[PDB]
Amino acid sequence: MSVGFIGAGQLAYALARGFTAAGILSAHKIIASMNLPTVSALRKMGVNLTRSNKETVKHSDVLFLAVKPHIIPFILDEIGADVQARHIVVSCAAGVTISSVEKKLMAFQPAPKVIRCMTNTPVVVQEGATVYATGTHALVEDGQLLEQLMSSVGFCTEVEEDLIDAVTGLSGSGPAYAFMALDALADGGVKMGLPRRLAIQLGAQALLGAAKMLLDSEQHPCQLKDNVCSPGGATTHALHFLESGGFRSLLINAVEASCIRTRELQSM
């Protein structure tokens, strides 16, 4: 019937701007919780600024917790009065254990339904990556709706919550790597004589075509790289410069640090 996003950050608008295109839920049935354009642009779509956390729970059948990990512990005390066994709560905040959202909302009422997820920000273009873990009192029907809700958003599967911290470094911090990568590539286009906008547009579809090829064609990523490299070609000379500076090594210890700190920060 109606979904509600307590948050208003980039993630909140990303879900709303991604839910509206597929039409699983329209822009009329939504409740939120006012200087940034995220609320104003969503207000152009019809998002309601309740400005009170409790003023949205009873109006939101399923609630998404888009608040920050430091805001979410005290948030549970303010909404648990309006949390009910009918309401499906989905915590989008990283490092938030399912116990924290279930044990805190256990005091207000029994049988709390919660789900932990890690959806990316490139869901505005309907191609994000997310995973979820079913809570204790989260039934099969509750998870079937969530996947269907975020499968319109992109890749959505059921992983166990002990692996969502590692997905954070690969699916959550991942898109930032391509932004910096597509910057350096575009910065290489100008140095070799390409316009800035064309250097952004040419490389962007090259990353789409490389990612889309690996997804549907289940060949190993290196095998797809080997078929591109023609013997005695320009591609093999360029790949040498990447592996000399440890191109693979940097991206490897990057995901490690993103997952390591998320565990350290959650220890609070």
| Residues 162, 152: Cα–Cα separation, whole Å | 25
Cα angle 17-114-128, degrees, rounded to a multiple of 5: 30
Residues 209, 163 share a domain: no
Boundary of a domain, candidates 167, 190, 212:
167
Strand order in the sheet with 3-5: 30-31, 3-5, 62-65, 88-91, 113-117, 128-134, 154-158
Task: Judge whether 67 is annotated as a binding position.
Answer: yes
User: For the chain, how many structural domains are there in total?
Assistant: 2
CB 142 within 8 A of CB 8: no
Task: Judge whether 202 is annotated as a binding position.
Answer: no
Boundary of a domain, candidates 167, 200, 221:
167
Residues 188, 81 share a domain: no
Task: Judge whether 80 is annotated as a binding position.
Answer: no
Structure resolution, Å: 3.4
Task: Judge whether 93 is annotated as a binding position.
Answer: yes
Residues 6+ apart with CB under 8 A from 107: 80
Structural biology method used: X-ray
Residues 28, 7 share a domain: yes
Nearest alpha-carbon partner for 114 in 141, 82, 142: 142
Task: Judge whether 259 is annotated as a binding position.
Answer: no
Task: Judge whether 94 is annotated as a binding position.
Answer: yes
Boundary of a domain, candidates 122, 140, 167:
167
Instruction: Give the pairing type, strands 128-134 and 113-117.
Output: antiparallel
CA 250 to chain centre: 22
Q: How many Cβ atoms are within 10 Å of 166's Cβ, its own excluded?
A: 17
Residues 6+ apart with CB under 8 A from 262: 94, 95, 165, 168, 169
| Residues 203, 258: Cα–Cα separation, whole Å | 26
CB 105 within 8 A of CB 89: yes
Residues 114, 44 share a domain: yes
Task: Judge whether 10 is annotated as a binding position.
Answer: yes
Task: Judge whether 8 is annotated as a binding position.
Answer: yes
| Residues 213, 177: Cα–Cα separation, whole Å | 19
| Residues 131, 133: Cα–Cα separation, whole Å | 7
| Residues 19, 234: Cα–Cα separation, whole Å | 43
Task: Judge whether 23 is annotated as a binding position.
Answer: no
Cα 197 to Cα 47, 181, 201: the distances in Å are 33, 15, 6
Bridge partner residues of 156 (DSSP)? 130
Structural domain that includes position 212: 168-268
DSSP codes joined into one string, the chain: --EEES--SHHHHHHHHHHHHHTSS-SSSEE----SHHHHHHHHHT-----STHHHHTT-SEEEE-S-TTTHHHHHHHHTTT--TTPEEEE--TT--HHHHHHHHHHHSSS-EEEEE---STTTTT-EEEEEEE-SS--HHHHHHHHHHHHTTEEEEE--GGGHHHHIIIIISHHHHHHHHHHHHHHHHHHHT--HHHHHHHHHHHHHHHHHHHHHS-S-HHHHHHHHS-TTSHHHHHHHHHHHTTHHHHHHHHHHHHHHHHHHHH--
